[PDB]
Amino acid sequence: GLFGAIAGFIEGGWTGMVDGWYGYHHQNEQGSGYAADQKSTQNAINGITNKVNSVIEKMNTQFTAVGKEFNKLERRMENLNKKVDDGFLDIWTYNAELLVLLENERTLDFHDSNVKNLYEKVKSQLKNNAKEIGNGCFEFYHKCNNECMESVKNGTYDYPKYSEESKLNRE
């Protein structure tokens, strides 16, 4: 995509994360593991579900239509009937394939932005209390226990609270 998160700053996805699309991984003295960001994932799902259903639901049902018999002196009309069917088939095939390709590209950019935005949310929370490393990770300069990890994920990190410790650990 155009935001550069998927197989970009993030080396690749997590096969160990099973409760969502976007999320976090953590490690501290009390344990480690993966957890999904339910708010980000559900919003991504609702957007995509509406997009898929829009493409399908806006299409009308194909109503009964069959070919027509023509006699041997009605070739001009038979050829007109065929022209109409071929023209409609060509229009719908071109549009169906091109629409899907255009929308698949946009879906992947949608996802690329959503994970990048999650990354920035944390960067803005942590400020100088952690450093950026590759693979989309923030390495803390202070002890961050399980209560801290939940606080960072929820967007409630009390930045100044940990600033004295990080200033010392940063040397």
Partner 1 sequence: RPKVRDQEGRINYYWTLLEPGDTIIFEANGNLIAPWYAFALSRGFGSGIITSNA
- Positions touching partner 1 (CB under 8 A) are 63-66
CB of 9 to partner 1, least distance (A): 56
CB of 69 to partner 1, least distance (A): 9
Nearer of residues 18 and 66 to partner 1, judged by Cβ: 66
Q: Where are the beta strands (DSSP E) in the chain?
A: 23-28, 31-36, 130-133, 137-140
Give dist(CA 33, CA 25) in Å, integer.
6
Nearer of residues 2 and 65 to partner 1, judged by Cβ: 65
Nearer of residues 67 and 160 to partner 1, judged by Cβ: 67
Nearer of residues 64 and 104 to partner 1, judged by Cβ: 64
Listed as own residue / partner, the contacts of 31-37 with beta carbons closer than 8 Å and 24 or more positions apart are 31/146, 35/153, 37/118, 37/153
CB atoms closer than 10 angstroms to residue 81: 14
Give dist(CA 16, CA 39) in Å, integer.
19
CB of 24 to partner 1, least distance (A): 54
Nearer of residues 61 and 104 to partner 1, judged by Cβ: 61
CB of 70 to partner 1, least distance (A): 14
CB of 86 to partner 1, least distance (A): 20
Give the three-state DSSP class for 117.
helix
Please give the single-letter amino acid code of residue 87: G
